[PDB]
Amino acid sequence: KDPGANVRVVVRVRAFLPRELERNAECIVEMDPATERTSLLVPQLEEKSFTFDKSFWSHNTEDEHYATQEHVYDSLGEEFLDHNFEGYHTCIFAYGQTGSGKSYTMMGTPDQPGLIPRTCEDLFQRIASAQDETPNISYNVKVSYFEVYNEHVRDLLAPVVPNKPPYYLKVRESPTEGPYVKDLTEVPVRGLEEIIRWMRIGDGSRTVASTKMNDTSSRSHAVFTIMLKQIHTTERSSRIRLVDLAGSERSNINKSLTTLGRVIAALADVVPYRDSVLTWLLKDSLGGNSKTAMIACISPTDYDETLSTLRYADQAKRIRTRAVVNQV
Amino acid sequence: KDPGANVRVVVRVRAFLPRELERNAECIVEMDPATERTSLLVPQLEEKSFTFDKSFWSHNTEDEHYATQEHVYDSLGEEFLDHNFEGYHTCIFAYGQTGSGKSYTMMGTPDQPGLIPRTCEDLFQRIASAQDETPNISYNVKVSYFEVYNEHVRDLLAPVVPNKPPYYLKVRESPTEGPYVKDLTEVPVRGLEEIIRWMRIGDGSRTVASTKMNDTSSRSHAVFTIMLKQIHTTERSSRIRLVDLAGSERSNINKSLTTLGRVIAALADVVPYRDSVLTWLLKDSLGGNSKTAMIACISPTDYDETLSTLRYADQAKRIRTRAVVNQV
Ligand SMILES: Nc1ncnc2c1ncn2[C@@H]1O[C@H](COP(=O)(O)OP(=O)(O)O)[C@@H](O)[C@H]1O
Ligand SMILES: Nc1ncnc2c1ncn2[C@@H]1O[C@H](COP(=O)(O)OP(=O)(O)O)[C@@H](O)[C@H]1O
Ligand SMILES: [Mg+2]
Ligand SMILES: [Mg+2]
């Protein structure tokens, strides 16, 4: 009786890590194959159940209801890509503690490819296939990619130059298409190959964690975005926003990830979109004209951290967006 | 009775892949903890033993003689770094079929770090520690990084620009310090953090495979090189060469990896160094002034492809280099 999309919410518990494996480390998450339910168990102060649009069990290979990367795409990813081609603005963000599997989910591995390349691959096949199915229609892909870190935005695709003075982009406002980053490089991409190249580039340009030997900063959020324009004399374009958020564990190096929580809170139970760069840039995706999905990633061992992730996810089911179809 | 270093040869069999795992896929490699022996078994035309400087069993976690990434470094990597700081030119190359674990070994994972970052970390700790142990001495690190692909050399650290006309560097010859790449960017690096940044950049700049969704070209060789200069009014520099070769399976897109074989062959049982770009640039690491290691990577399932890798590794034991200590 009103037109609002609910934020699609989905959880994915990952497999034990060698570190934990070592410890005969306990597992405190259970997902029902049938009901889409996730249960936080009590390790040997209480047991909690939740229901989500999907509860992805990616914790044990040999389980009957195991959820592969392909299976995650096939549920969430693909359907959202449909919406994009039907001219919706899409947005999927991975949220959860560091090491919960946000990056694995979104990006995955060379031979374990996650949401993003999946989408890319899917996308281009469609375009290719929509040649002789619909020859008076044709497509046009640009990709852009940036991370926020310490309330600073940097263009992950921009060339980088030794004796580095790291260079930050400005955030400004389309009176019609929301907030955006002033001057972010957007790169026309003709194929999978080309796209997944710029993906790889941008990626190795992220902030390096100094805590691991060899990692991306656990406190950097990254936004990969595919703008997709369909031309028929007349054309319209949708934009695919795909986000790998900074870990959630219990300018300021924090502001963004914490005030994000404040937003989701506002939108369920003045939304403080502008109290942070990330939330301001995603203002539209979290309540503007966006078909939007949250993927709560959870560790199978961490009790309070998982309980938090879950609480948010639960709270985020209540958010409603005003998702439309674009045209010019 | 003559001063030649033997090429150090080492092999590492990796764990099954999920794909193989699926198949109850057979395992045909066996390493003796005690003797450094590797045996190619007969699947259920013959059984073949070999001995190497080390035979790394990285195929099953719960095994008593399992070889971690850390343990691979602690054998090969460290000793070699020692040689570097003593002023030797080092070079370690990974060789084997695609998917054998070359990249995993050399580079590894964010939380599975291989040879390279390990080396970088070790290196910088030494320098840090050699502050107040030896304050009249101090160090100076530059990193450079390039891949060869289709007999083309490209500067993986050079900035890259949209509407990309991919840009190839030239090969010219130091009448004194061998072959080298004319104008390759070398980047002074002040810390672990700085170096492993530039590693990540260069990396995401490699050629994209179009066979996988999301991968580096199985046919690109990458040469990561750390030039380390020790200053005392007087200084000298050694260079660490770390190589992730193109796979070995059954300008021309092949020339390099195949004529490499022809070289190793020449040096054991006119060495055709210049018949390819790769072998010409490594001319020096393969028989010049270089302490040098080969790491043969092998799949635990692939019979002929492993037998070939092994054949070469066996043959490479015979190579002797003319490894010195440098000074100016
Ligand atoms: N769903 C999964 N199943 C098995 N292993 C996983 C899964 N997700 C992540 N991993 C592994 O766990 C580690 C942490 O994953 P990562 O995606 O970096 O977490 P985060 O992005 O939250 O830091 C990585 O080694 C990753 O490969
Ligand atoms: N030693 C190992 N133990 C367990 N898994 C491995 C090992 N080496 C490689 N793998 C996995 O096998 C796959 C192929 O490894 P990779 O290094 O890419 O081989 P190559 O570089 O020869 O293509 C990767 O997913 C890698 O993470
Ligand atoms: Mg991550
Ligand atoms: Mg590789």
Q: Do A196 and B213 touch (CB under 8 A)?
A: yes
Say if the Cβ atoms of A197 and B208 lie within 8 Å.
yes
Give dist(CA B214, CA A203) in Å, integer.
Answer: 12
For A67, the token pair is 């959820």
Number of the ligand 2 atom closest to the C-alpha atom of B58? 1
Four-way CATH pick for A1-328: 3.40.50.2000, 3.90.209.20, 1.10.630.10, 3.40.850.10: 3.40.850.10
Q: What is the 3-state secondary structure (H, E, C) of chain B?
A: CCCCEECEEEEEEECCCHHHHHCCCCCCEEECCCCCEEEECCCCCCCEEEECCEEEEECCCCCCCCCCHHHHHHHHHHHHHHHHHCCCCEEEEEEECCCCCHHHHHCEECCEECHHHHHHHHHHHHHHHCCCCCCCCEEEEEEEEEEEECCEEEECCCCCCCCCCCCECEEEEECCCEEEEECCCCEECCCHHHHHHHHHHHHCCCCECCCCCCCECCCEEEEEEEEEEEECCCEEEEEEEEEECCCCCCCCCCHHHHHHHHHHHHHCCCCCHHHCHHHHHCCCCCCCCCEEEEEEEECCCCHHHHHHHHHHHHHHCCCEECCCCCCC
Q: Give CA–CA dist A149/A278, Å, rounded.
A: 9
Distance CA B324, CA B5 (A): 9
Name the one residue in this structure whose structure tokens are 């953090």: B193
Nearest chain B residue to A18, by CA: B61
Catalytic site includes residue B247:
yes
What single DSSP character describes residue A290?
-
What is the rounded CA–CA span in Å between residue A197 and residue B162? 12
Residue in this structure with the two tokens 């990367």, named with its chain if needed:
A69
Sequence-distant (6+) residues with CB within 8 A of A142 are A186, A187, A188, A189, A226, A227, A229
What letter does residue A2 receive in the DSSP assignment? Answer: -
CB-CB contact of A251 with A150 (8 Å): yes
Place of tokens 């951290």: A305
Between the CA of B98 and the centroid of ligand 4 the distance, in Å, is: 6
Dist CA A300 CA B167 (whole Å):
47
How far is Cα A299 from Cα A105, in angstroms, rounded to an integer? 13
Residues after which a C–N gap over 2.5 Å breaks chain A: 44, 232, 250, 269
Residue A118 alpha carbon to ligand 1 centre in Å: 17
- Own/partner contacts of A186-190, CB < 8 Å, gap of 24 or more, are A186/A142, A186/A143, A186/A144, A186/A227, A187/A142, A187/A143, A187/A144, A187/A157, A187/B162, A188/A140, A188/A141, A188/A142, A188/B162, A189/A141, A189/A142, A189/A143, A190/A141
DSSP-assigned letter for residue A285: T
d(CA A83, CA A202): 26
Residues A215, B111: C-beta atoms closer than 8 Å = yes
Residues of A within 8 A of B201 (CB-CB) are 160, 204-205
Spans of all domains in chain B: 1-328
DSSP A37-95: EEEE-------EEEE-SEEEEES-TTSTT---HHHHIIIIIHHHHHHHHTT--EEEEEE
Three-state secondary structure call for residue A298: strand
Integer Cα distance of B199 and B193 in angstroms? 10
Task: Give Cβ neighbours of residue A267 (< 8 Å, ≥ 6 apart).
Answer: A286, A287, A316, A318, A319, A320
Residue B303, token pair as written in the block:
């019979």
Contact criterion met (CB below 8 Å) for B192 and B124: yes
Crossing angle of helices B192-203/B115-129, nearest 10°?
Answer: 160
Gap between the Cα atoms of B154 and B171, Å rounded: 11
Q: Which residues, in sequence order, are CB contacts of B286 under 8 Å at separation 6+?
A: B7, B263, B264, B267, B273, B279, B292, B319, B321
Residues of B with CB under 8 A from a CB of A: 17-18, 61, 108-111, 113, 117-118, 121, 159-162, 185, 187-188, 192-193, 196-197, 200-206, 208, 210, 212-216
Experimental method: X-ray
**Residue ID of nearest Cα to ligand 2 atom 9:** B101
C-alpha to C-alpha distance for B227 and B283, rounded to whole angstroms: 17
Task: Count CA atoms within 13 Å of residue A117 on its CB side.
Answer: 27
Q: What secondary structure letter does DSSP report for A21?
A: H
A237 labeled binding residue:
no
Partners of A171 in beta bridges: A181
**Which helix (H) or strand (E) is A148 found in, with range?**
strand A138-149
Phi/psi at B19 (5° precision): -50, -50
Q: Is the four-CA dihedral A43, A46, A47, A50 of positive or negative sign?
A: negative
**Cβ-contact B29, B298 below 8 angstroms:** yes
Which residue is associated with the tokens 């029902």? A32
Q: Which of B111, B197, B202 sits opposite A212 (nearest CB)?
A: B111
Q: A257: helix, coil or strand?
A: helix
Question: What residues in A contact B73, CB-CB < 8 Å?
Answer: none
Calpha distance B203→A197 (Å, rounded): 11
Cα distance between residue B256 and residue B223, in whole Å: 13
- Spatial distance between the Cα atoms of A85 and A77, rounded to a whole number of angstroms: 13
Residue A159 and residue B159 in contact, taking contact as beta carbons nearer than 8 Å? yes
Burial grade of B43 (CB within 10 A; 0-12, 13-18, 19 or more)? exposed
How many CA atoms does the CB half-sphere of B54 hold within 13 Å?
Answer: 21
Phi, psi (deg, nearest 5) at residue B125: -55, -40
Does residue A102 line the site of ligand 1, with CB under 6 A?
yes
Is position B244 annotated as part of the catalytic site?
yes
CA distance A61 to chain B (A): 10
B-chain residues near A211 (CB < 8 A): none
Q: Which of A142, A214, A220 to mutate to test the interface with B (most CBs of B within 10 A)?
A: A214
C-alpha to C-alpha distance for A266 and A262, rounded to whole angstroms:
6
Could you tell me the two tokens for B198?
Answer: 């530039």
Q: What phi and psi values does residue A81 have, to the nearest 5 degrees?
A: -60, -40
Quote the CA–CA distance of A56 and A182 in Å, as a whole number.
37
Q: How far apart are CA A209 and CA A218, in angstroms?
A: 6
Give the distance from CA A228 to its chain's centroid. Answer: 17
Sequence-distant (6+) residues with CB within 8 A of B116 are B106, B107, B108, B199, B224, B242
Give the integer Cα–Cα distance in Å for A17 and A69. Answer: 17
Q: Which tokens is A162 given?
A: 């030794």
Integer Cα distance of B35 and A259 in angstroms: 59
Cross-strand partners of A320: A6
Sequence-distant (≥ 6) Cβ neighbours of residue A324 within 8 angstroms: A88, A289
AA letter at A309:
T
Q: Specify the DSSP class assigned to residue A168.
A: P
- Sequence letter at residue A103: S
Is A18 in Cβ contact with B61 (below 8 Å)? yes
Residue with tokens 């392909």: A70
Burial of B14 (0-12, 13-18, 19+ CB in 10 A): buried
CB B225 within 8 A of CB B93: no
Query: What is the distance in A from the centroid of ligand 3 to the CA of A208?
Result: 11
Q: A291 and A89 in contact (C-beta within 8 Å)?
A: yes
Provide CB contacts within 8 A for B302, sequence distance 6+: B97, B100
Q: Amino acid identity, residue B21?
A: L
Residue pair A31/A57 in contact by the 8 Å Cβ criterion: yes
Please report where in the chains the tokens 């656990």 appear, as a residue.
Answer: A218
d(CA A115, CA A71): 10
Q: How far is CA A92 from CA A158, A287, B279, in A?
A: 24, 13, 47
Chain A residue numbers with beta carbons less than 8 Å from the beta carbon of B109 are 214
Cα–Cα nearest to A222, from A242, A197, A250, A238 = A242
| Closest by Cα among A96, A23, A91, A22 to A58 | A96
Minimum distance, in Å, between the CA of residue B172 and any CA atom of chain A: 24
Residue A45: exposure state from Cβ atoms within 10 A (0-12, 13-18, ≥19): exposed
Residue pointed to by tokens 């300021």: A252
Give the span between the Cα atoms of B92 and B114, in whole angstroms.
12
Q: Is the CB of A300 under 6 A from ligand 1?
A: no
Q: DSSP letter string over A225-242?
A: EEEEEEE---EEEEEEEE
Residues 6+ apart with CB under 8 A from B163: none
Exposed e or buried b per residue across A166-197, where buried means at least 16 C-beta atoms within 10 angstroms of its C-beta: eeebebeeeeeebbbbeebbbbebeebebbbb
Instruction: Give the strand pairing for A48-51 and A29-31.
Output: unpaired
Please work out, in degrees rounded to the nearest 5, the angle formed at the alpha carbon of residue B30 by the alpha carbons of B25 and B32.
155
CA B152 – CA B173 distance, rounded (Å): 17
Which of the listed residues B31, B72, B104 should we mutate to test ligand 2's pocket, taking the one with most ligand atoms within 8 A of CB? B104
Decide whether any atom of ligand 1 lies within 6 Å of the A101 Cβ.
yes
Output the CA torsion sign for A86, A87, A89, A93: positive
Minimal Cβ distance to B197: which of A201, A202, A208: A208
Distance CA A168, CA A184 (A): 10
- Please report, for chain A, how many H helices and E strands are present, in that order: 9, 16
Assigned token pair, A91: 């947005």
